[PDB]
Amino acid sequence: ANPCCSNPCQNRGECMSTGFDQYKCDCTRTGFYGENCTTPEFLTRIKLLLKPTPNTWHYILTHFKGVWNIVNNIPFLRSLIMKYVLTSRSYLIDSPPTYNVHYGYKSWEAFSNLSYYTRALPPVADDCPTPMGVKGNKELPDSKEVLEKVLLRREFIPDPQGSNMMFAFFAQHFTHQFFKTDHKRGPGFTRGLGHGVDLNHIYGETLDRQHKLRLFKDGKLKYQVIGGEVYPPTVKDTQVEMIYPPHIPENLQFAVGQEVFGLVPGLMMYATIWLREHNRVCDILKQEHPEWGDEQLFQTSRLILIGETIKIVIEDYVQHLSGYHFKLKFDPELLFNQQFQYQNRIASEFNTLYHWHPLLPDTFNIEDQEYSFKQFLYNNSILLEHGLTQFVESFTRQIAGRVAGGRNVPIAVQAVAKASIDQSREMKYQSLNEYRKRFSLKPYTSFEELTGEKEMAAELKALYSDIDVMELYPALLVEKPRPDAIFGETMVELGAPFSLKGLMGNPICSPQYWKPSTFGGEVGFKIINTASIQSLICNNVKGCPFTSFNVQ
Amino acid sequence: ANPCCSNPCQNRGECMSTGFDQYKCDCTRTGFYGENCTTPEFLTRIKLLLKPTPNTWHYILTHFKGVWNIVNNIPFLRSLIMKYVLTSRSYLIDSPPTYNVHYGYKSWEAFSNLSYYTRALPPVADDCPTPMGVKGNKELPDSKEVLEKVLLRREFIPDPQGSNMMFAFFAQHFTHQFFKTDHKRGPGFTRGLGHGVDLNHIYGETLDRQHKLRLFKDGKLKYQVIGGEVYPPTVKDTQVEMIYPPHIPENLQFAVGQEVFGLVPGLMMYATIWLREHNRVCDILKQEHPEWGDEQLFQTSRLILIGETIKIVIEDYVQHLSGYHFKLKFDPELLFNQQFQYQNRIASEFNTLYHWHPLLPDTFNIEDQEYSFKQFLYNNSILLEHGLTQFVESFTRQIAGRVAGGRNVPIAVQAVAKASIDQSREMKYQSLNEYRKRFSLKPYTSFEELTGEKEMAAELKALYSDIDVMELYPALLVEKPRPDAIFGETMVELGAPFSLKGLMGNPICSPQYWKPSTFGGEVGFKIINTASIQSLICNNVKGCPFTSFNVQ
Ligand SMILES: *[C@@H]1O[C@H](CO)[C@@H](O[C@@H]2O[C@H](CO)[C@@H](O)[C@H](O)[C@H]2NC(C)=O)[C@H](O)[C@H]1NC(C)=O
Numbered sequence A, B: 001a002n003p004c005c006s007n008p009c010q011n012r013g014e015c016m017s018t019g020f021d022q023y024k025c026d027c028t029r030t031g032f033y034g035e036n037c038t039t040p041e042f043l044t045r046i047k048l049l050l051k052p053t054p055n056t057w058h059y060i061l062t063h064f065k066g067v068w069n070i071v072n073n074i075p076f077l078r079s080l081i082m083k084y085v086l087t088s089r090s091y092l093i094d095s096p097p098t099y100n101v102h103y104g105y106k107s108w109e110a111f112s113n114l115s116y117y118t119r120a121l122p123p124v125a126d127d128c129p130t131p132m133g134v135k136g137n138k139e140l141p142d143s144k145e146v147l148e149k150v151l152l153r154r155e156f157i158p159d160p161q162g163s164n165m166m167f168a169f170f171a172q173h174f175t176h177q178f179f180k181t182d183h184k185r186g187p188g189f190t191r192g193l194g195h196g197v198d199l200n201h202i203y204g205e206t207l208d209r210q211h212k213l214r215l216f217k218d219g220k221l222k223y224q225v226i227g228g229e230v231y232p233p234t235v236k237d238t239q240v241e242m243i244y245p246p247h248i249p250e251n252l253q254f255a256v257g258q259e260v261f262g263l264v265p266g267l268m269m270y271a272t273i274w275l276r277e278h279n280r281v282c283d284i285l286k287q288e289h290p291e292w293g294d295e296q297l298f299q300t301s302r303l304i305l306i307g308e309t310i311k312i313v314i315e316d317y318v319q320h321l322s323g324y325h326f327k328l329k330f331d332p333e334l335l336f337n338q339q340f341q342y343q344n345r346i347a348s349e350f351n352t353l354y355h356w357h358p359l360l361p362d363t364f365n366i367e368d369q370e371y372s373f374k375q376f377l378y379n380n381s382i383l384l385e386h387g388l389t390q391f392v393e394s395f396t397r398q399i400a401g402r403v404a405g406g407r408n409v410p411i412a413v414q415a416v417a418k419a420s421i422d423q424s425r426e427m428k429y430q431s432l433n434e435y436r437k438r439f440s441l442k443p444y445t446s447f448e449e450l451t452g453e454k455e456m457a458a459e460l461k462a463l464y465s466d467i468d469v470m471e472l473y474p475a476l477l478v479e480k481p482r483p484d485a486i487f488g489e490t491m492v493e494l495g496a497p498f499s500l501k502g503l504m505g506n507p508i509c510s511p512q513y514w515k516p517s518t519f520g521g522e523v524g525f526k527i528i529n530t531a532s533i534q535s536l537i538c539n540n541v542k543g544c545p546f547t548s549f550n551v552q
């Protein structure tokens, strides 16, 4: 078998075979040399001594709030820190991208083919003795066993950071513009050829789909009026394809950019909000540009809403789950004097640690009503019944589950959680420890250290036997939560590089785009730089209800 | 009507309408302020004073050969200048790309849609009074008039720099991997979705086409043996589509990556050479990696040949036409400490100024034979007759015409030259002077200054009346050539940024790719770093005839 199967190369060295039973490690620019790139250079020895731990950084950013209250009001220093936050995370990601599910080596097929999710780590070779190379048994433990024992939800474990359902459905709505798996090809394939925040979940993946959804007047998208409230148009009125149970009434078959956003009314809520936001920016742009035609009013409104998205995600969405007292900042001009690639390819592993199944409640509580999963699914009549106002007010109050910590996956979606385990195996994922070393983390030495707890850790040791054979996805949902937080170390340290790269690696953040003229002047430019989840609801949702990603 | 038709904004400022008859210029990071971005900042005033002219740079690099002979042997200094050569040219190009033929403003359609050629300058609005904006008459002069008078070839004007037919057909073969116009859509559209050097003109634009051309054993491409000589396979044996006169025998219908390379036997020569080179590198990679399968031997051989191409282009191809005594250097490690986007998008204007029609001779001289255009076109039996050896030996001897200077377009291809004039008009190109200011050149003040001569300059003034209405493409072929050179100032200053960006903006030049493991070891890695047009022929062409881009 592959002499590279054992995963010998350390510190991001690359293993190439030099015979049937021989390998060589390429230690090019890894700060290490030696057979498996383990002998550190003198400057590397220094850096290794001087960088503190992720757990060290998290403590500082989650404490000393009073001194952060000072830092948050010193522009240069605030800009200085955010500059290091952006830069230091963005060396973890290969750009241009390297591997995918079919190529454990760099190739033009891997690079050029955009139908692929890329890969932070190359897939385990198909001729390897074990599913993880050389370690463990011939076959990995039963997914159903792992699922039931340490993953499935017994009693509801609420998020200590106080995440609500506004946060839950945002994450679902937001990330599904680039998490569009091509099931007809496999789990390692995406239909999101934009590979980032293009808002195709609002406008459409293709130009053909977009023109069906557009009104072709004043740059607006088509809509319908029900009960005096603005909602998306219908599938019959537009003939864009949507995924629905064939028993759904025609007037309830809404048509939006993403074809699956009819799944849950939570997605259709944001889909309605973000649609209203488009036709609001259009009105503002026509207010300043009466000379503009429909085509330019649309394209400009799109770029603005893209910036609005990134703005909200950083200073509202990421701000919340980080639990940082340091107040984040969406500002592309911090990267202009830095080496940064304005491009991004979505990774399979980033879609993997995004399966925040524990974030889903047991019932969906709206106004004075508790809906089961069976009642909520594909039921937009719920949305028409309460309206967006009562929807936001309710979802801002209902709390979401804890992702990390173990045993919090709602049993309604058990099959989906078991699929995440199965698909990651099918895509020949490397072990948890290999992904930790990949992101400069220290390999867990025991299952107990992973959980900071004895019960589940004993369950896991009976299943996997060896800590170096533990799988990535189940480890995330059981990892010892950070203190009073929603995630563990591995979730944040792996997901943060993937996230800030897809956001800042957007063409509108590049110096040639990041300028008032691109967005229709200072008026349109302001819309982006002052964007927030509160004003997004205040502007589009009737009555302007208070909203947040946190419960009061 | 559009207030920005007059092209008011200077120094790369962007024009935006602020009313039906009102405009605003965005002077963001242009080094200028004021109404049309013309008031220079103090540091800009300094740089403007200290920045030498392009003609100043050209004289230095084309003189002091003895002192350059010293510079060429001092690695650091040699690395130092090339670093400035790469960097200083690569700020002229927008990256990520901005405009295309349909969008004179930044938009997501312009950025995401890869079917478009991008645009250095946005197209003139469709509602502008004149085809150039506001200057000139209602209609531009007759293309046939311009063509016949100053463009068409009277007596053959040989290239002073001594370009041969090896250089002419290389340029045609090389640049046609990203110059694949989608005529079904229009001149502003490309079928080259790779938008760079992907060698799809050898392997294929699509994965489907590639698999038809591969042998699927040892990573090699399919071929046939005629007269003991290796040639491309046939259309019947592979069923890849090729463009042929349906009167062509079946054994003469060769199948290569690019579907039009059956046009002239000069293209079919390199297509045969570059095919032989593939199955030569495969044998070497199998020599080092007997454990490798067909798929990896192919993908690795492609990446190497990609590097081989870039290597040859810089240090042989660009080296020649530059006429520099300074010896160029293909070395990606010069950009690692520099801000550089490893991405590229092809521009309509770059395809325009690469219509080197004057480079084409009156007859095609092989061995002791002189072929007309009518005899050469679609006649591969010429290639079988003389073989590659006699093909290279002859083409290295035959000289090519002078591009700039005026009146050197062979009349046999006059319609192609008239198409270049027409297409540029159809694509709403801005004037010559607007493209010069765009690339920091000084606007020509008279037609004579442009020609450095009186007669063509008068014929041109009778046609266009005003120098600010002169078109880009005809200006290139009549421009006052540099001292005993093939081009004028505008050709080099516009084309050099476009070229070095598409070359270095290749993923294999990125730090994560540029390492021995990517190319199968140090044996494969050296193949790239030692690549040259001489060894490319020596290795693949029988007898190893001396070859160059210059006549002896
Ligand atoms: C990207 O890769 C996928 C998978 O290798 C390609 O999809 C295959 O395309 C061939 C071409 O005809 C088909 O025969 C296969 O059935 C396809 N397989 C799957 C799983 O889709 C895809 O064509 C590639 N994309 C590009 C642009 O080359």
Ligand SMILES: *[C@@H]1O[C@H](CO)[C@@H](O[C@@H]2O[C@H](CO)[C@@H](O)[C@H](O)[C@H]2NC(C)=O)[C@H](O)[C@H]1NC(C)=O
Pocket: A206, A207, A208, B113, B114, B115, B116, B184, B185, B186
């Ligand atoms: C890129 O833009 C071109 C031109 O706008 C698109 O081509 C058009 O596509 C629509 C979609 O159905 C067709 O109805 C038109 O006939 C096409 N016109 C031309 C001239 O080709 C193309 O689809 C766009 N590409 C992408 C990926 O969106």
Ligand SMILES: CCCCCCCCO[C@@H]1O[C@H](CO)[C@@H](O)[C@H](O)[C@H]1O
Pocket: A055, A056, A059, A060, A483
């Ligand atoms: C300037 C103040 C520096 C304090 C740094 C905090 C160091 C303690 O940080 C600790 O790191 C541990 C490592 O696993 C974690 O388990 C703990 O949760 C965390 O408190």
Ligand SMILES: CCCCCCCCO[C@@H]1O[C@H](CO)[C@@H](O)[C@H](O)[C@H]1O
Pocket: B053, B055, B056, B059, B060, B482, B483
């Ligand atoms: C060592 C410094 C020598 C200065 C070299 C530049 C001066 C001569 O350069 C001249 O510049 C003109 C445009 O600028 C061109 O028309 C001439 O052909 C070119 O020779």
Ligand SMILES: Cc1ccc(Nc2c(F)cccc2Cl)c(CC(=O)O)c1
Pocket: A318, A321, A322, A353, A354, A491, A492, A494, A495, A496, A497, A499, A500
């Ligand atoms: C899987 C994951 C991991 C981390 C984050 N956000 C985040 C974080 F939680 C801490 C520090 C930085 C960032 Cl960008 C996020 C949020 C997101 O970018 O969608 C997801």
Ligand SMILES: Cc1ccc(Nc2c(F)cccc2Cl)c(CC(=O)O)c1
Pocket: B318, B321, B322, B353, B354, B491, B492, B493, B494, B495, B496, B497, B499, B500
């Ligand atoms: C239209 C054009 C302009 C310039 C060049 N090469 C070139 C040159 F001619 C002088 C200095 C640098 C470079 Cl990269 C070339 C040759 C090429 O890179 O294909 C074409």
Ligand SMILES: *[C@@H]1O[C@H](CO)[C@@H](O)[C@H](O)[C@H]1NC(C)=O
Pocket: A006, A007, A008, A009, A035, A036
């Ligand atoms: C790592 O290097 C050591 C010696 O430095 C060698 O014995 C070993 O085989 C290498 N690989 C692994 C996976 O340990």
Ligand SMILES: *[C@@H]1O[C@H](CO)[C@@H](O)[C@H](O)[C@H]1NC(C)=O
Pocket: A374, A375, A379, A381, A382, A385
């Ligand atoms: C949809 O929601 C409504 C409440 O508005 C509920 O009465 C109905 O039963 C739901 N549909 C299904 C199929 O459960």
Ligand SMILES: *[C@@H]1O[C@H](CO)[C@@H](O)[C@H](O)[C@H]1NC(C)=O
Pocket: B006, B007, B008, B035, B036
């Ligand atoms: C440039 O600015 C001047 C004043 O600074 C103004 O009169 C003129 O209209 C502007 N545009 C052009 C094309 O000159």
Ligand SMILES: *[C@@H]1O[C@H](CO)[C@@H](O)[C@H](O)[C@H]1NC(C)=O
Pocket: B374, B375, B379, B381, B382, B385
């Ligand atoms: C093709 O070239 C051959 C010379 O090898 C010549 O005899 C023949 O006439 C040419 N074909 C045509 C159609 O002119």
